[PDB]
Amino acid sequence: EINIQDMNVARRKIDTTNPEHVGATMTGSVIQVVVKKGDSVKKGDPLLITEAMKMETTIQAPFDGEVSSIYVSDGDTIESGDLLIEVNR
Amino acid sequence: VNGFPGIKHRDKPVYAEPRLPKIPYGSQISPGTKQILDAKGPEGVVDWVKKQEEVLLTDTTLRDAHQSLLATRVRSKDIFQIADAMAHLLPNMFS
Amino acid sequence: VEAAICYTGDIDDDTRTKYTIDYYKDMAKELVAQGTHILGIKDMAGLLKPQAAYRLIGELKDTVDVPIHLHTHDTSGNGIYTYAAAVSAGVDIVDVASSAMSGATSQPSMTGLYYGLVNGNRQTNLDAQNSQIINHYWEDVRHYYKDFDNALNSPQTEVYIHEMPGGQYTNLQQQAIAVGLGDRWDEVKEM
Amino acid sequence: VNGFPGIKHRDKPVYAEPRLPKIPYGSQISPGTKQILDAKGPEGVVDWVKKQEEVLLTDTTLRDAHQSLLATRVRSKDIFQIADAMAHLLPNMFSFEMWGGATFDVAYRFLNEDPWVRLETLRKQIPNVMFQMLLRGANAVGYKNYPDNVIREFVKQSAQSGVDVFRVFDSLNWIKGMEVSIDAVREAGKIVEAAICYTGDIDDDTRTKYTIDYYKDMAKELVAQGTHILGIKDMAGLLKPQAAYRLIGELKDTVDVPIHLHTHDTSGNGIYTYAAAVSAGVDIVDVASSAMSGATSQPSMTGLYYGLVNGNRQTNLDAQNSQIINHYWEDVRHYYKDFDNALNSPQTEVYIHEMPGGQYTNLQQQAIAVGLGDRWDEVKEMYTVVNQMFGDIVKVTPSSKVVGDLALFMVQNELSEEDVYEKGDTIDFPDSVIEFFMGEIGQPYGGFPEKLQKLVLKGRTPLTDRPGALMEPVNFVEVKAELKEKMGYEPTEKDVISYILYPKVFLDYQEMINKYGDVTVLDTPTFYKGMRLGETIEVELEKGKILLIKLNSIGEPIADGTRVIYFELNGQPREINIQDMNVQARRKIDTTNPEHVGATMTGSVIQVVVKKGDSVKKGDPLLITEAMKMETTIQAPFDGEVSSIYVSDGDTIESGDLLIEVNR
Amino acid sequence: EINIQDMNVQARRKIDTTNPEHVGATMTGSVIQVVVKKGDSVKKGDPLLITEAMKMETTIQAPFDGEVSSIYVSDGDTIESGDLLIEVNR
Amino acid sequence: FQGTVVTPFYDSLLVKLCTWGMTFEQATRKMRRNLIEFRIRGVKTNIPFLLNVVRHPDFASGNYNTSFIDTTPELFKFPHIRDRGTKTLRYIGNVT
Amino acid sequence: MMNRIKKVLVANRGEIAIRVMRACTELKIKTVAIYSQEDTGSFHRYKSDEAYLVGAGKKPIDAYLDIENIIEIAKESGADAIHPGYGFLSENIEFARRCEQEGIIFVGPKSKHLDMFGDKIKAKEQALLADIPVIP
């Protein structure tokens, strides 16, 4: 399996059994993503900021770890359950 | 195109037309508690209430009911549509 | 002016010495003195059980000389029964909704109350059939508001433990889910 | 790929894991009514009940609650999961209503699982509280009439497999109709709760047919016929509170058996009616978990407890425990959203039309189906009219269906009551109406209306006896042997009885589990929605034996719509083929593989001459293609077996396109 | 506007509720059989197509006299209530 | 096993490889071949280190002791990976 | 072939768990694996006749040190014996005793052996007693 960046381009749900999957709690959009793939993070650290009828919330790291894949971008519409970020232990 | 803020963006369902009561032209609205108030004031209404053997009813459909069930979202258009039937069909409410 | 007393606690439990019947009675007297025309009893969490309602209303009718107006929520499923007791104790006015917008965290059904009482010694003045007609409209209109019809809509008797008023339960579950605590909703209720 | 039959095909939602009660290992189950029954029989239980100062509770959560709210779709897996907690946390229930009604055929028919298994599994998990079923006297749980020996065998099995209390009713309140069932329950050593169906309004002396004296006389007959407990079945929720106080009060002075009241909360007054019944000394009432209570279901058990805790007469329920059991149902109910279509508010028109709980939702469905969704109010009005036409009858399954079938029929054909009386000899009535007037579901109180009977029967001759008394007994040995041939191996007694009760669905069930296994084991979201890409599930085949399954991808379809689905099962990659029944860039030959047969030229496919699996020889015709209308026949490059086919007649093709594969 | 048959085809439309020429699925299921063709002439009550709902068949009838126009479904097609199935011109 | 997900919570052990011979030397030849013959992709392994140990002439001799590894820094020099395959796939991946 | 041991619970994970399960199967003994949440996909869980989640709620290493839950599982599955492999509970006095209390064979030496060879000093005392050389 090799990774290739697609220079010129259905939304995935959290696998509930995996706690590395960080999911949207609520229906809204993504205001800002605060971390990058590879970044190192601690329990409670900010990962991204989401909106729900314009009232902001900050999705926190559920534990210590290393940020893996990111499935959303600033602006993206999101629904509760959507997989947003993955945080490896 | 963009959906309504705060909800899952989905296709408009096909809805049943709401059942509206048929109120014949020229039916008159019975007077009720608003007339008593207008004529004889608060104390006139209070006195009227004291004389009532039956239990009186206040209807919260237009406020508290949907505040509790539908996050207060019931819109005026839907409220105005039934209001005339309320005046004709439910004229004995306290309020 | 319908100044209201908010009901809380449980006057049938003399373990609970703060919000007792005398508290309610004294507060009634003060409000009449302050000049209300009707006395409101606002049971915002649906905590007023039927036997308490009978005593509470019965006693308030012996205490003050204004009509009484009772408001409850059917959160526990006993709202009608509580209204039936209130009515036997001579309450003057009660708060109801159209069937289709009634039950659970809302008011008890106006048409349900009518029929619960029509064969008793004291009735409501409602035309059943007309209310049923108005109700058809709400049966249909309510579908429009599905995205906001997220109240659980069954009985919920934990209210007698946590005492969260009707609206706030749904509302506060929301904030809990929002903030990542959807899994710990029971802890939040305990807290 | 194809969605579940009968619902909108949508993505599996993300569900909350249900809240299960934590039962410390080695907690003991308290003994309850099942022990009393096992030791001292029916009369011992009856005597125990008489001693109880508190009102006792029967819990309908596992049967009637979801029959009314979720079209009886609650699956066994979800029921077995909470059963152990029920044994520990609700040990003071009189009974759990957990079998009968529609659960029998719904299990086989729509859930593809075995109700006998449900009964026997639960029986082990809940050894302390009696189990209760609803039995139509005449025909058990079946769809028609059956010879006596069938009814007798069913009851015998049910009782053995673990049913303790049989609530036996007849759709017209025809006592004769129940006599077999009642006797078989006596014969089996179990409790008989024969029931009177409540209808009308005893507080209205305008209405002289179904009066309190009617109810009292019927009580006396049933005690005489030897019931242990008297059931009052208020299937439409029509029994108001002041009527309940009198009715129960007077029945307690009249008969010397305990009384068991069952209502629906359709009107919103169920609790209040239960409160009155309790003041009049009723012995047992039917309740459900809050989250499965209200509207067309039973009143809340926990709501009743709190309505009575400060009165002169209480229930024996541990509130907090019931609240814990309830959390489970709060969560599980989300799984059944596609079946949670009951309106779920009060509905007081029931006092006018008298449709029982289930049938309202059910009959609205048929009305919408048949184009009458806009005229649902007319249909309700016609139900009322038809009930009057029949002389005012007790309406519950199957009598209710008759009134429904005619009500639809008459709105559909723009027919009034008068039109039926005028043109009835030239009108072909629905079969259920003919069957009704023939007496095939028994005899109504006050008899049939003569004029309307003659016009429906059209010369035919009524019967006046139990349709089943005149039926040829079933030869069990013969049926068993027929079934063994059909199934391919030796059936159990239960298999046999089910086959007899429901032959078409029983065999459809067998076909289904031969093809897919015992899908009963699947978690309910997967049962109804399958799997999302990247999802992993755990399927518990059996205690300790779990399949861990992951869906990786779904392949592109070939010509006949077959797709390869790529799973992992317990770490093993597994590819399985699924035909995509509703399909809404074309692949090139791998030039190195000579099994790949490719378009030589640009054009279209006129005809494909072979099928997947066909056997072929070098030079044989595979398909015919076109190039500016000049035909060519693509030949087999060698001997072999035809594999996949990527094109269909008419398909446009370009040179290099892979058309067919031919395995060596 | 001209009509062209697409010889090689690779969200489904809802009834406009105001137009009674739009014949819509009453219920969720599939189409067993379409009984008419574009252009066919029909009378009130005539069979247009047969649909399924948990395998219990129903026959969608012509709401009035007229001429069958466009057809939006084929045998086998999955359908949801409100889906436009057939149009019948007056 | 192919498809497994190594976690950080427990030991990393993938497989214990054992070789036997009539002599230690014979067993040594086999350990070398087998270590080289393993293909494991998706995670790093300690194989480069085991090979260094098993090829070192002190190991072959049979005369080593507790301090051998800690005092033999050659064991921690590793050949550069040949990953021509992987690079070739990135190229193919990129143009594709 | 065996006498009392018809079924064995392997109270471990990974390599040694599989090793024990293979031995068991060769002796016509049935096997029970246990696995933590975090090892739900571990392949030892696939090599047993039965498998059960152990230590729900606990941190990952603690999950395979959950004596009570392991015993529950052994009892509920009808295991006659428990093999603790190495690491985890294989040298834990309490766990071994607890097997004894439940009538479940602990596949290993006696509790007192674990005791005596657990503290380095009492082991050294035992070597000295057995009259074999030791380190100053």
Ligand SMILES: Nc1ncnc2c1ncn2[C@@H]1O[C@@H]2COP(=O)(O)O[C@H]3[C@@H](O)[C@H](n4cnc5c(N)ncnc54)O[C@@H]3COP(=O)(O)O[C@H]2[C@H]1O
């Ligand atoms: N002694 C009796 N005689 C005739 N009918 C009887 C009765 N006791 C109970 N019932 C019937 O049962 C209902 C429930 O009574 P409960 O005391 O449970 O519930 C009662 C009770 O809490 C209270 N209540 C009414 N009258 C009362 C009284 N005289 N004394 C004490 N409490 C009363 O109001 C509730 C409902 O009154 P409601 O008549 O609406 O409804 C009553 C009534 O229909």
Ligand SMILES: [Mn+2]
């Ligand atoms: Mn309020």
Ligand SMILES: [Mn+2]
């Ligand atoms: Mn029922």
